[PDB]
């Protein structure tokens, strides 16, 4: 009927549009989350290890009073 | 009178489902008394009681139709209270009802004499309470229908709820 | 070097000193030394994938660690033991974890107690197949999460509880959970999308009701057809509610077939839909 | 047909979901970024305690 | 143009899939980590708690020692729809993992600080009794 | 196990010892023990689901901790107390948090002070309905966040401020906040897409102006006909500005009906939209 | 607790003791006492939002801390000073941070050194507008990240380097940086995703070459038509390369108008695209 076929296209593109950008976000996302993933790999390291430094201190102090 | 908390349940058998009566326990009420189900301070419904062993003490069982009219729920808590009718000005003398095939599976065009319908309706739903806009099922010649009260008159004073007696004229 | 040697030395020292050997201070330094030994052994056992030996060894070190007087570190050791046994050959995976929570809980550490509590209920189902004992945990744990205002985790657990509650015939007890987790989900515009599935589950779970327990729950559900997310929720439901109120085990069984197109049905839905499918058949010619 | 003019919002709604998903994660970055300067700096002081506690061991023990 | 749009946009609907599918892939790596990290922080939190304990003892010791084209175009939408549901799945796992950890960071930051003080005070009393 | 026994011993130990008990030193070591007692009690009071008891118990341990000089861990205890009363039945949920912040703040701990500060304004609004104080907190807190350069966080709070500022008739003061949060969110391409809603809210908020402002702000906004997201911002606004300048309460309430399809209206929008819809009629029948 | 008073007493104790004051032992703690004082001062300075003074206060406690032998907690103070001045109204934000990195660097803490290094290059640009030094920092910083295995962050900085390098005429050096960051991105099939935009930027950057550096860069780009991410990188480029090789400042200016639909053009792209739009006319009129 033309009118519906043209109006159709109009709504389809307006749809196509909004889509492409939402995809743009994930791209930046995978780049952010990963950039943060490396910022935590060192944390886990500095943490469970700090437990060793403190554990060695609390131990020496105890054997320094008994 | 005062009232008592109850619990909505399901209709025991089909027999009690073709009488349009709130099935209860013999250890609570007796077949013949009338009550008023309270679900909200703005919604009051009146039903007819009919004891049955299957029923558990402290609960009233309703049929699918009724439960699709009063808007109850098997599990919720309702407040049932004894209600007494004034047969002096509440007895139904002329009640109009809207009838239509309940099941769309059994739809025919055969003729159904109303005079015979009003004779069997009063012989099965006698001494019971009906309200304007109430829904229920009618069993006539092994054929199920969907009734719907439209207007109720006394033996003229239009009443919202009445008590179908023996000499009740239905249209 | 070898664990078999360490276990031996550890044993010959894990003995409460008495008499002269005890002296003025028997000290818990011995029991602790043995704990370190067994830990060192259990680890190399975890190397040769002996697991069984690793786990039981950790149980040893942890058990002694209790005789040491340090419930905390011990508890986490029990966790290590659970981690071994879990992905191992023998069992005890359930024991160690219970022995861990009994410590975290009494110690006043619910935050972590729930962390392992969910792991527990997660194993007692996918393994022991003890739903009745799994749900109890998913629930108590959710109570802890809800106690730590951790709404998120709490809901993660509640979903499990109700999810498996409907499988154990507990339909009403399921819908109640869905109603609660549903109300405490709208206050957060970051759950709006998920709030659908909740209403779908709750409207599906039927405690043999014949009324509009669902026909009312579908109304409470604010929807507008051209929303879609919602189409994957009540649409079908409405069509199911009509097929049940008319004892038609053909309109319902067809609707499940069509809906299984736009949105696949998971094992949960399959099992329940079949139960509802039977509630129709046994009801027609009855 | 109508599905086209309709489904259009089926994503515009998600475009909002991620809009928050992208923000949520970023909000954690700063929470972990500061935690990275106070946690690592924390153990840094622990190093001072490890050295101090080690010396108190070679004198009173 | 009419056909160059009913088909080109149709290619966009087909592409609309990989667009929302590549998003899942990007979401997986995120979730997979958010989960992996979730467990990590658990052993990480233990550090703030482990130190919280020892420091209390260490402080005490330092105190004791210190003194059909449209039919398909309609189907592709259904495809996107089915995937939109997925976007909700990750959106929730990502969400519930974010909120659960943010509050975790709070506890971490708290204890971490609480212990930092004990270290400073102890470091000011120990450094003097040096050598 | 027995909280009712622990509380008792708790007070029986929290007291500056004397006579032979004091000897030479006495205080810290004792009072701390009591703090641990009350914490141990409050915990089981939490599992017991008493809450009230748990909360007041934490208040006890908290207050006591101060008598030992340890504002830090103390304040964190007050946080536990607040969490208790919060998910409890009595009040005090607000007091505990005030006692927490008074400590974190003066201690130089603004990073965490803001953390509980927002939690505070959140309770003071969702419960106490004390918006006038809530705004004061959401704001000061945002200032702290902005100090740590924690942009996003500060914006979250600002959004709260403005959002609840338009509800309290403060329309102009709201648009200003949207302007600030809008100018400090453009340099980052991760907030571009979002800057829209800000302009939409700011353009909606009307201090009963009788001209541009909104027609000027919509202009300040950068949009392109091919824009996707922008369709969910000014595109609607323009049509609304025209339906307002022409006092046509038929074109406004219509366009909002259409927009309620492509982008559903949240509670906020609805409230303000209806307010504008009334201002139109209030200019027609005048 | 007067601020300026604390600033006075702090000075009263920050000095090598002598006479009867020195007594038997020195005062390695006196200097520390003073540090704590100035900190107490900067506290209330940050209270009244007088930041400036707070910052200048932290500079004092920090400088003093160095005169005590404690680079660690000192540098952290320099950070507090930087955060203060930064959020404050005066400058100094640059000095404190430089004085912070020299410490995090000499000590052995590059992770954090780079963490403040990027903040630095970011301020030396958005504020002081000194790109010639900002790039130097963005780069050295990326080097440190690239040595902490931290790949991503390294690239985060590299993008800044090349990004602002092409906006300074350094077009070639830019494409080279994009090549490096492009190669160190394929090793991770989890980055395959962003490795496009790099090719787009690199192909756009032109050092006024007469050959097909771009037609070659777009060729090296592995792309498949059905691909989606890719259609947002080279596809446009090819068309732009043809519009340039045909001195047609119309097809290029219209293709950039079309691509602006499917993919919004950020600031960068815009500026550069215009530079190419002028190279076309300039070649037409050369």
Tab-separated table of N, CA and C in Angstrom, chain D residues 33 36-37 40-41 44-45 48, chain G residues 72-73 76 109 111-112 115-116:
chain	number	residue	atom	x	y	z
D	33	UNK	N	39.449	1.211	43.276
D	33	UNK	CA	40.613	2.033	42.969
D	33	UNK	C	41.140	2.653	44.255
D	36	UNK	N	42.439	0.177	46.509
D	36	UNK	CA	43.742	-0.267	46.030
D	36	UNK	C	44.847	0.616	46.595
D	37	UNK	N	44.488	1.842	46.961
D	37	UNK	CA	45.454	2.785	47.512
D	37	UNK	C	45.450	2.797	49.036
D	40	UNK	N	46.734	-1.664	49.749
D	40	UNK	CA	48.138	-1.903	49.438
D	40	UNK	C	48.994	-1.036	50.354
D	41	UNK	N	48.529	0.184	50.607
D	41	UNK	CA	49.241	1.106	51.482
D	41	UNK	C	49.140	0.577	52.909
D	44	UNK	N	51.601	-1.981	53.488
D	44	UNK	CA	52.846	-1.230	53.428
D	44	UNK	C	53.281	-0.907	54.851
D	45	UNK	N	52.307	-0.574	55.692
D	45	UNK	CA	52.598	-0.266	57.078
D	45	UNK	C	52.874	-1.558	57.815
D	48	UNK	N	56.308	-2.381	57.892
D	48	UNK	CA	57.014	-1.643	58.934
D	48	UNK	C	56.834	-2.371	60.260
G	72	UNK	N	56.897	5.857	52.934
G	72	UNK	CA	55.581	5.262	52.679
G	72	UNK	C	54.401	6.169	53.060
G	73	UNK	N	54.030	6.083	54.336
G	73	UNK	CA	52.926	6.861	54.886
G	73	UNK	C	53.072	8.358	54.585
G	76	UNK	N	51.781	8.845	50.992
G	76	UNK	CA	50.317	8.824	51.079
G	76	UNK	C	49.771	10.203	51.496
G	109	UNK	N	57.330	1.033	44.401
G	109	UNK	CA	55.916	0.856	44.191
G	109	UNK	C	55.469	1.503	42.869
G	111	UNK	N	53.226	0.217	40.645
G	111	UNK	CA	51.802	0.016	40.416
G	111	UNK	C	51.088	1.322	40.740
G	112	UNK	N	51.311	1.763	41.968
G	112	UNK	CA	50.671	2.958	42.461
G	112	UNK	C	51.277	4.223	41.856
G	115	UNK	N	49.489	4.650	38.903
G	115	UNK	CA	48.139	5.069	39.269
G	115	UNK	C	48.027	6.576	39.452
G	116	UNK	N	49.033	7.188	40.063
G	116	UNK	CA	48.987	8.635	40.218
G	116	UNK	C	49.572	9.333	38.997
